[PDB]
């Protein structure tokens, strides 16, 4: 229930970057650690993204649950 999600701008953000670099996600880590930041100030049922972006740290652990 997006009634306001801070950090929609961020996950729109990961897409912008990724057209600043031409879709190279490797570039937009950067950007991608942004949403980190964003989601990390809440709980994930204040945003929709942010709700993809806690379970993005699920799928970390394919990379390694801690390697950044």
């Given at each position: 229930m997006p009634q306001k999600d801070p950090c929609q701008k961020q996950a729109c953000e990961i897409q912008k970057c990724l057209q600043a670099n031409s879709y190279m996600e490797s570039k937009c880590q950067a950007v991608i650690q942004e949403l980190r930041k964003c989601c990390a100030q809440?709980?994930?049922?204040?945003?929709v993204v942010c709700s993809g972006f806690e379970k993005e740290e699920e799928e970390n652990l394919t990379r390694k649950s801690a390697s950044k």
């Open positions: 809440y709980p994930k049922g204040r945003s």
